Enzyme design. Structure first.
Site, mmCIF file in Angstrom:
data_model
loop_
_atom_site.group_PDB
_atom_site.id
_atom_site.type_symbol
_atom_site.label_atom_id
_atom_site.label_comp_id
_atom_site.label_asym_id
_atom_site.label_seq_id
_atom_site.Cartn_x
_atom_site.Cartn_y
_atom_site.Cartn_z
ATOM 1 N N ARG A 109 -84.947 -5.879 2.030
ATOM 2 C CA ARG A 109 -85.445 -4.750 1.261
ATOM 3 C C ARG A 109 -86.555 -3.980 1.960
ATOM 4 N NH1 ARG A 109 -83.009 -8.304 -1.808
ATOM 5 N NH2 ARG A 109 -82.229 -7.710 -3.875
ATOM 6 N N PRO B 28 -58.560 -10.652 -0.760
ATOM 7 C CA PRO B 28 -57.397 -10.594 -1.657
ATOM 8 C C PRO B 28 -57.312 -9.293 -2.435
ATOM 9 C CG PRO B 28 -58.621 -12.655 -1.904
ATOM 10 C CD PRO B 28 -59.497 -11.716 -1.147
ATOM 11 N N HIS C 142 -73.242 -1.363 -4.455
ATOM 12 C CA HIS C 142 -72.749 -0.322 -5.351
ATOM 13 C C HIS C 142 -73.758 0.792 -5.587
ATOM 14 C CE1 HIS C 142 -70.480 -4.007 -6.125
ATOM 15 N NE2 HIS C 142 -69.475 -3.231 -6.489
ATOM 16 N N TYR D 120 -68.796 -3.742 -14.211
ATOM 17 C CA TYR D 120 -68.872 -5.197 -14.204
ATOM 18 C C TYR D 120 -69.439 -5.760 -15.496
ATOM 19 C CZ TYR D 120 -68.197 -4.345 -9.243
ATOM 20 O OH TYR D 120 -67.707 -3.921 -8.031
ATOM 21 N N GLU E 34 -54.810 -12.006 -8.747
ATOM 22 C CA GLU E 34 -54.249 -10.830 -8.094
ATOM 23 C C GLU E 34 -52.865 -10.481 -8.622
ATOM 24 O OE1 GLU E 34 -55.916 -8.862 -6.035
ATOM 25 O OE2 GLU E 34 -57.676 -10.164 -6.147
HETATM 26 ZN ZN LIG Z 1 -59.442 -8.322 -9.166
#
Ligand SMILES: [Zn+2]
Lengths: 595, 195
Positions: free
Chosen positions: A151, A328, A487, A497, A357
């Site tokens: 940071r 993935p 993000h 999220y 997935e």
């Molecule tokens: Zn996913």
């Protein structure tokens, strides 16, 4: 010649030309991600720029038809997805200025390195070597310089770029009839032109804040149990009534508390159910994992994988000179081309990832009959909520007894169940105050409640009050500590999220009532139940053709998000947490600091 | 002893588009429709009116074979009484149709890497097509009332759109070679008997 018919004629030309050109963009992106070479990067960028220029040419053509004159609700949802102007509403100098900042913030983050103050020759990037310190090391001082140095050497460089990022993103927001850029980001959950299913941009604040006040009894007992066990791993470093230091949370940013689980295990003599060794003795390969994964979806009522799924996907690492992104990813290429790209190993983590997935694929296979602009989830958190409930049902010992990964005489142990529920709560309940506070800080920064001279003042005052996390070293206004997240420096909405986690157990509690599951929610398994997959397919086949408040009610019976299904999942742990915390202090005061 | 050349129609190396379908007049020959149904290579064999149970005793006048390539999701639109971009703007079958619709997946033949754009379908038209009507004209379609003046811009579209046929596509978005045999049983010498 009404504009309803002129926009319907426009969309028929658009949807076939978009599906033809995004498939060439997706096929060029697939040929990059599995065959990383110099020619494939250029062919991804050439075929990606054709899609990125076609979509901006027809976005200006979509604004010719007024949205108030359209009567059909299907056309309005496609037009609003196409008339949504972004940086194009700015001038030519400011739009070039905005993309210069966004590319500079994404490259300072990715190529930024923190150097050890003891050994200056050890400068580590985040993903290779600095995340290894924050997820594996158990030393206070070793995690201190990796946290502070990330940071200071990187986040301070993003501070003069993020201030001009705020002003430019608020300028294009107010030119698109929005209040601020945070109000622009809350338009992903905004639903309009519905009778009772309207969701306002101000209602997202009133629902995320209201649902968070009910996780506070669950999070405080989790915070008190983590603090009581982190004061054993780190003696004389955490006060028993104070907050947690930010570099002792098992992550770089304290986003997930999953890596602290070896430091806090409820029953050390009862190991967790790990079936990675039963697959080796049964001689499982990468194909057997995905064949057993699709048997779960056939048993729940979802259809089989396509013929072109098995011959075109990359279900194993090729073992050749082809460089492969091994993350993935489930691929919806368009034109009914569904693929999964992961370097699958014969383990238990890749066993649950193959169910996660493929749950993305079963969502992608469901809205394939929708128009091309409506071929997505109901919101930004609906898509990953469907995949996460497949890993929940697959990881249960009831499902691992049916497929042969556990012995038939496997007796379930309540001591092993508290070990499973605590490990789930460190990933799930530990991330909800972090996800709430990161978006609460960022919404107020865009709106103007937080001035630029009070950015890091209100960043740490909110983190002590909400997350119960105190900074180990003092940070003045030259720092930018939220910008150290991926993000934030790469312009992504982080509320995807929070809401996905609320939908994950709202979907799970809804499907386990039609599955006739007798018992607690964490032991539920919706396999061999064609009523919990037909109900899920009702929401899955909608896509983005309906509001997400309509899509939530088709499974859970409630239009808004509800955290009481999430509290029911950890209710056996919450009973155990209140008994364990009877000799400790539950809660924190913001006065105590490590400095 | 001439026989009807179905190998020229079914096993042709080049197939037509659906907006300009290739109709072949087959007459004065002997046809064997038992070999067609018992080939086990056709993904779609739907006969309308005439039963598909090997009727090799009926004398027909002309056997018109309409050869075209569509995608796999649009094979259901080659039934009598259907709606869509193919049944209305490209190839319309009458509601009193008496014939068979043969269609098989030709992803091995009509798909190329990068895309096979040699097959076109009419996306827009002012009105629907008559049964057995072919429109090969490529005038600019105006959506509303503004003139196009021979160039397609805002609200003016080129009516033909190209199929993108790739071998990696799904089964719905895959090229199907459709052969529509049309039988015309009228007051005629009825040359095509095929005993
Ligand atoms: Zn996913």
């Amino acid at each position: 010649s009404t504009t309803e018919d002129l926009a319907k004629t426009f969309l028929e030309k658009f949807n076939y030309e978009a599906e033809e050109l995004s498939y060439q963009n997706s096929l060029a992106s697939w040929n990059y991600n599995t065959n990383i070479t110099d020619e494939n990067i250029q062919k991804m960028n050439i075929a990606g720029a054709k899609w990125s220029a076609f979509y901006e040419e027809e976005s200006q053509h979509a604004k010719t038809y007024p949205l108030e004159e359209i009567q059909d609700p299907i056309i309005k949802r496609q037009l609003r997805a196409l008339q949504q102007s972004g940086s194009s509403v700015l001038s030519a100098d400011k739009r070039e200025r905005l993309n210069t900042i966004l590319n500079a913030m994404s490259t300072i983050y990715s190529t930024g390195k923190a150097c050890n103050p003891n050994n200056p020759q050890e400068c580590l990037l985040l993903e290779p070597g600095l995340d290894d310190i924050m997820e594996n090391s158990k030393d206070y001082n070793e995690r201190l310089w990796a946290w502070e140095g990330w940071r200071s050497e990187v986040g301070k460089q993003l501070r003069p770029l993020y201030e001009e990022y705020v002003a430019l993103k608020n300028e294009m927001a107010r030119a698109n009839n929005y209040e601020d850029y945070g109000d622009y980001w809350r338009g992903d959950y905004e639903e309009e032109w519905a009778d009772g299913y309207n969701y306002s941009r101000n209602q997202l604040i009133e629902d995320v804040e209201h649902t968070f006040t009910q996780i506070k009894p669950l999070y405080e007992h989790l915070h008190a149990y983590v603090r009581a066990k982190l004061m054993d791993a780190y003696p004389s470093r955490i006060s028993p009534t104070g907050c947690l230091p930010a570099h002792l949370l098992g992550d770089m940013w304290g986003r997930f508390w999953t890596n602290l689980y070896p430091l806090m295990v409820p029953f050390g003599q009862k190991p967790n159910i790990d079936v990675t060794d039963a697959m080796v003795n049964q001689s499982w390969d990468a194909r057997r994992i995905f064949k057993e994964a699709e048997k779960f979806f056939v048993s729940v009522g979802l259809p089989n994988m396509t013929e072109g799924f098995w011959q075109n996907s990359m279900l194993t690492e090729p073992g050749d000179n082809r460089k492969v992104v091994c993350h993935p990813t489930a691929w919806d290429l368009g034109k009914h081309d569904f693929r999964i790209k992961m370097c699958t190993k014969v383990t238990m983590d890749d066993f649950l990832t193959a169910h996660h997935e493929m749950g993305h694929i079963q969502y992608d296979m469901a809205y394939a009959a929708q128009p091309f602009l409506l071929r997505n989830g109901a919101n930004e958190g609906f898509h990953e909520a469907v995949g996460e409930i497949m890993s929940l049902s697959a990881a249960t010992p009831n499902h691992l007894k049916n497929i042969g990964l556990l012995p038939p005489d496997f007796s379930e142990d309540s001591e092993t169940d508290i070990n499973f529920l605590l490990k789930q709560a460190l990933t799930i309940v530990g991330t909800l105050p972090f996800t709430y506070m990161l978006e609460k800080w960022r919404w107020m920064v865009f709106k103007g409640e937080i001035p630029k001279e009070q950015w890091m003042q209100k960043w740490w005052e909110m983190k002590r009050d909400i997350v119960g996390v105190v900074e180990p070293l003092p940070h003045d206004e030259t720092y930018c500590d939220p910008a150290a997240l991926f993000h934030v420096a790469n312009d992504y909405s982080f509320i995807r999220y929070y809401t996905r986690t609320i939908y994950q157990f709202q979907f799970q509690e809804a499907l386990c009532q039609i599955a006739k599951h007798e018992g607690p929610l964490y032991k539920c398994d919706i396999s061999n139940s064609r009523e919990a997959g037909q109900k899920l397919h009702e929401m899955l086949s909608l896509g983005r053709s309906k509001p997400w408040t309509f899509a939530l009610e088709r499974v859970v019976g409630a239009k808004t998000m509800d955290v009481r299904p999430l509290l029911n999942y950890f209710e056996p742990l919450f009973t155990w947490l209140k008994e364990q915390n009877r000799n400790s202090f539950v809660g924190w005061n913001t006065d105590w600091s490590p400095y | 002893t001439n026989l009807c050349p179905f190998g020229e129609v079914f096993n042709a190396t080049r197939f037509a588009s659906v907006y300009a379908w290739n109709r072949k007049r087959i007459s004065n020959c002997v046809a064997d429709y038992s070999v067609l149904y018992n080939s086990a290579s056709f993904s779609t064999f739907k006969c309308y009116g005439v039963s598909p149970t090997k009727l090799n005793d009926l004398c027909f006048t002309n056997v018109y074979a309409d050869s075209f390539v569509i995608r796999g999701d649009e094979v259901r639109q080659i039934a009598p009484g259907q709606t869509g971009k193919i049944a209305d703007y490209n190839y319309k079958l009458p509601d009193d149709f008496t014939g068979c619709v043969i269609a098989w997946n030709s992803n091995n033949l009509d798909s190329k890497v990068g895309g096979n754009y040699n097959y076109l379908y009419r996306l827009f038209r002012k009105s629907n097509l008559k049964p057995f009507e072919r429109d090969i004209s490529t005038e600019i379609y105006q959506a509303g009332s503004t003139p196009c003046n021979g160039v397609e811009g805002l609200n003016c579209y080129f009516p033909l759109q190209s199929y993108g046929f790739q071998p990696t596509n799904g089964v719905g978005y895959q090229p199907y070679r459709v052969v529509v045999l049309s039988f015309e049983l009228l007051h005629a010498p009825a040359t095509v008997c095929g005993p």
